[PDB]
Amino acid sequence: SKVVVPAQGKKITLQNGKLNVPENPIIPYIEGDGIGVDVTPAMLKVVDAAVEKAYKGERKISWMEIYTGEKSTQVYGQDVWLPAETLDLIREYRVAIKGPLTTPVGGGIRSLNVALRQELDLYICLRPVRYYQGTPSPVKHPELTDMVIFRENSEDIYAGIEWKADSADAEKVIKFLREEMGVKKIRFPEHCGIGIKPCSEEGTKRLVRAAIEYAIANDRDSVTLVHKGNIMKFTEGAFKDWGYQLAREEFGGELIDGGPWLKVKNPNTGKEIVIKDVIADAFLQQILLRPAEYDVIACMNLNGDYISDALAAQVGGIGIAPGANIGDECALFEATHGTAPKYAGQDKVNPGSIILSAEMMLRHMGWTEAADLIVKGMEGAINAKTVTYDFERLMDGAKLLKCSEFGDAIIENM
Amino acid sequence: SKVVVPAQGKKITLQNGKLNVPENPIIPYIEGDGIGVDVTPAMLKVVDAAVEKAYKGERKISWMEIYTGEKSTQVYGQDVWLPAETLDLIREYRVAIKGPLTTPVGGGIRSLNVALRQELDLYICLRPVRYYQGTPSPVKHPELTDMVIFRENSEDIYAGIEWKADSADAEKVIKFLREEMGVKKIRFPEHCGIGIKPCSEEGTKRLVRAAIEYAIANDRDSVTLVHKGNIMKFTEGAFKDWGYQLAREEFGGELIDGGPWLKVKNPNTGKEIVIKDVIADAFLQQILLRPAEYDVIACMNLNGDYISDALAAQVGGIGIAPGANIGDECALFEATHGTAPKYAGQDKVNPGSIILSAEMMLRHMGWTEAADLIVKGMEGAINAKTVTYDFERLMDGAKLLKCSEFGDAIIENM
């Protein structure tokens, strides 16, 4: 209704579990607030150059701007932060990409990024983190990290189920817990906020299934379920058990030694994938001390959030980390950093996160060639030390490029 | 009743907020399971040598063994994992120290370490992490880390309030949430485990109060409240607001710029302590990229758990990290690592965690001199590269010592 659909261009189609991508697909993009105004132009330009180069003019993306966040209120009016037609247009065109998003405080508005994930049921937050050679790192051996994070997106304490201290609601549920359920375990029941943490069987088996499948499809070496199950037995500990059960039941997993670890034979390469588990706080220690031992990771919403932010910091990629939210019916690729308003409009932030999310988008579309040209470009620009301000501070002998120019530097190394 | 109280020795007394420590105090210690059998002898020996050296024979600790964990079932019978008299004896003698503890699986027994903390209301988990010069680290600059963690111990999802998927209880609370509270936000209400997350005003203001107080008493530069409040507004976000409120209300905090940060003038050194906050997942990134910016940290139970484990890994101290659980009526110092049963009895694990917890014990008792001799010993043994197996693997040119012998090496560098 305020989105203008491209006259040239054809909708991607879902013909039962498989994308049928035309040569001129319409892709919805959300520009993003803050520095989205800098990074999203850089991404449209390098993706265009990568499909122009890989398919020699046969394929072309018809980009369609849709709205969410601060720009949505400037287009539809001050009150609409998430238009109902963004949800419909992402549902319809199947794959979309977005920049950083501002959620307002003061108006009872819950996180717009988590709202897109939940409203569209994009239950997989996929976070690949690997080291790009030559980026400045705080650790001695960043090259040892090559992990892919499957974070569950639709349950955990992120479901937003909570009531304020001293609200009627809070008083009411605390009353139910103490009188009807007999909980004598709340230390101070007055002036007390309450949050609900759900974890279901369906919720964890659909995310773990996608994790093992990813591991078979890419011949990864192991799947690690991380959980804090010693303290949370019926939510986090239920996640590890349902995950091992699904590896037994659906993938024909077998005990290594006398457990708990399983082996799943890859039906294509013949190799064995270890299904193991580690407690979440020991895992935060293990990615730093023994990163080469881990590969595909499956975990719940909050842990997945902490794990990927932590891992993206140790490989030097807080600003070049890609991400995707994948459901059964659509997928949303995204800059995983914030809107950083102080730099907005200055053409200086790193466009690397949304560009590498666009290569995840292209690879998902089946446009592997265009996608390999982007990570080729990326490795070469970073190796050339022809780099953005955030990388140049920490490097010696680098050439400082604006946001837009690092875009050109990715095209030059293609 | 099976503890034998020392014939020589006198109880420490609490004479309103202040410990009155005799020259021959009786200290309860829990030996610990697993490698507790190796580390606790090493600690009794170096603490004895430190008080013998500092006070030239005037002071002496009368050690009293009390029981919890696997050793408790060998002394009181197979069913008693936590004797009621351990709780009483720690309450009574005021300060105790413990080794690692085995919680059994299969018998519905919840974490014995969290049970001691809750049952005794030791609401402060204090975790000091600093780098000891010369220990092998995975990061380029471990020397930049000097932080003290005030983790809340009595609320959060750690209160153990949860019900199994498909249990009657679970069905009942899910029914209450959907019908009486109107929650349409649980994605799959069948086969669903539920955990409760409480956060009260009293609970967070008593921990934040102790954090600021610590900062005044030791002239630390800042107190950072870390929370995941953008998603959990009424538990984690309530923690940051109550913490800033307490810094305004009780410490006379003033706005820096136009907020949110506050300044608290130290009434003894005249210096300004910054009260700031950072989101928990960005913080996990910031301790690795800008560790020199943080100092005292205040946070809830789960975050505090993750933060300290992560920070102890980057300074090389997964096995030499000390810790304390402090309440208004008693304190329990502890090895913060696990029972590691494969090494138990072999005299090879690092006794460093429980020894540095004993220096926290001595400092708490007011025996500062004996306590400075232990960290003097520690720095010198580690600097001598006269070290335990876990440190020697990662170092070149080290001399390998058994557990007991690293104890002697701490006494030799005193």
PDB file of C-alpha atoms in Angstrom, chain A residues 19-20 28 113 118 164 258 278 309:
ATOM      1  CA  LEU A  19      12.401 -22.642  -3.315  1.00  0.00           C
ATOM      2  CA  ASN A  20      11.720 -21.990  -6.944  1.00  0.00           C
ATOM      3  CA  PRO A  28      11.949  -7.194  -0.060  1.00  0.00           C
ATOM      4  CA  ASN A 113      13.534  -7.763  15.842  1.00  0.00           C
ATOM      5  CA  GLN A 118       7.880 -14.550  16.449  1.00  0.00           C
ATOM      6  CA  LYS A 164       5.648  -5.983  36.769  1.00  0.00           C
ATOM      7  CA  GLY A 258      28.481 -45.920  27.618  1.00  0.00           C
ATOM      8  CA  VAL A 278      28.037 -29.323  27.410  1.00  0.00           C
ATOM      9  CA  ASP A 309      27.742 -12.437  20.584  1.00  0.00           C
TER      10      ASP A 309
END
